[PDB]
Design a protein around this nucleic acid. Structure first.
Ligand code: DTP
Ligand code: MG
Length: 418
DNA sequence: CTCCAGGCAAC
RNA sequence: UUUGUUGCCUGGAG
């Protein structure tokens, strides 16, 4: 059966290689991903037989406080490298059980389904005429999943009694705070390999309820949004779905994140819209500011690495960042930020030549006319003031940086579009 | 299509 | 320090 299908050698080996490639910090027994192969070889005959007998209880998850981009504290649950391996072996077998019957409008944590599909369908509804959105998010979503309602939904397709006892055992296994087990009443661990799938199993009935209601929607994780023709119809369905998820699935709504507002005034998965009739996708103001804050720390303030290294470090971030944010339809702001990136990268190049004699030595070697070299080498202006001056743009502008190995932001934006 | 070193994003 | 999933991307062994 399913526990036998989970404990199959090929399914365990692929699950092992995942946590190995993850390189995640150890659980509460302190054993690392590096020791994971050596640890299971010694403890396998026990682990295998003790969970075959239904006597196996997993070790508690490690509490780690990480800050969220919103500001608040996110509590993580880090399982034992074995407890991460076992959950993986459960996930790998539970995906073909649950995934095909998941919603067409479900996009979160799913194989072959991305954030772009969630936005393309989202712009496709407002383009059709549904020019109002009911954006919704859930209060501490992974912390608030009810154990009884969840395994009710797990038992719907899974008939094997041994795995239902095993998943419950993982859910019931507590946390370690000051060397003591702290039993869990509600919540699936924020860091359990299986836990993102269990999140989709619970809210599949919410998907089924919305599909029965005949509503045009997009869901990614707990961040769900329904696309309506009007503000009156949106406000109406804002309360009736809140009542549904609070009663039938027992979940609390984050009212600070949830709104009935216009799609272009709100952000969805790092993207926003334009007030146009056929609405174009734009960068959300949070996503622009997260980029700008990252470039400020990547470019040298009082930092000390090699500049050819720095250019490559800027390269790997920007080219990756544009890989996700290729979906935006406004290249104008993308043209500005690349110019801003060049402008910011000019600042740390200007301070590198600290001496006035080195300033003249390099600018004359670059090709710039002596008339302009001596005019700006001994200037009294500030460091950020000098980076916008006509002469520093001539010696060190667009043509210089591209020759120095800086990969252009806009060039690869159109390359990924083509 | 599977796996390895790394990176970007969403959650 | 910092976990997990999912998508994509650069390079590599098949
Ligand atoms: N880095 C992560 N690692 C593991 N799980 C994560 C991570 N980020 C998000 N999740 C999971 C747990 C969250 O409950 C769920 C939905 O994300 P999100 O709404 O941002 O957080 P949240 O619901 O815990 O907080 P909030 O109460 O502030 O809305 O996705
Ligand atoms: Mg939430």
């Amino acid at each position: 059966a399913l526990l036998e299908r989970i404990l199959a050698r090929d399914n365990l080996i692929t699950a092992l290689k995942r946590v190995e490639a993850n390189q995640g910090a150890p659980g509460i027994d302190g054993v690392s991903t590096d020791q994971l192969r050596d640890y299971i070889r010694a403890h396998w005959s026990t682990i295998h037989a003790q969970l075959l007998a239904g006597t196996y209880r997993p070790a508690p998850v490690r509490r780690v406080e990480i800050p969220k981009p919103g500001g608040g504290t996110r509590q993580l649950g880090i399982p034992t490298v074995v407890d991460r391996l076992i959950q993986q072996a459960i996930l790998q077998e539970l995906t073909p059980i649950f995934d095909p019957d998941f919603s067409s409008s479900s996009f979160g944590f799913r194989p072959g389904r991305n954030a772009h599909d969630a936005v393309r369908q989202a712009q496709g509804y407002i383009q059709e005429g549904y020019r109002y959105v009911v954006d919704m998010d859930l209060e501490k979503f992974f912390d608030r999943v009810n154990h009884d309602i969840l395994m009710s939904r797990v038992a719907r397709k899974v008939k094997d009694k041994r795995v239902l006892k095993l998943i419950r055992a993982y859910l019931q296994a507590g946390v370690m705070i000051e060397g003591v087990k702290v039993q869990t009443e509600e919540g699936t661990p924020q860091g359990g390999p299986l836990s993102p799938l269990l999140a989709n199993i619970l809210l599949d009935d919410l998907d089924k309820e919305l599909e029965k209601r005949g509503l045009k929607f997009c869901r990614y994780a707990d961040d769900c949004n329904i696309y309506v023709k009007s503000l009156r119809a949106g406000q109406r369905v804002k309360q009736s779905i809140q009542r549904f998820l609070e009663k039938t699935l027992k979940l609390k709504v984050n009212e600070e994140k949830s709104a009935v507002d216009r799609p272009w005034k709100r952000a969805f998965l790092g993207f926003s819209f334009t007030p146009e009739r056929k609405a174009r996708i734009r960068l959300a103001p949070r996503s622009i500011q997260r980029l700008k804050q990252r470039i400020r720390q990547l470019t040298n303030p009082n930092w000390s690495i090699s500049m050819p290294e720095r250019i490559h470090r800027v390269n790997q971030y920007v080219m990756g960042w544009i890989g996700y944010f290729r979906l935006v339809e406004t290249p104008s702001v993308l043209q500005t930020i690349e110019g801003w990136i060049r402008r910011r990268l000019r600042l740390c190049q200007w301070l590198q030549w600290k001496r006035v004699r080195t300033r003249i030595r390099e600018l004359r070697a670059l090709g710039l006319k002596e008339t302009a070299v001596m005019e700006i080498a001994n200037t009294r202006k500030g460091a950020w003031r000098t980076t916008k001056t006509p002469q520093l743009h001539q010696a060190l502008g667009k043509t210089y940086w591209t020759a120095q190995g800086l990969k252009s932001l806009t060039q690869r934006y159109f390359e990924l579009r083509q």
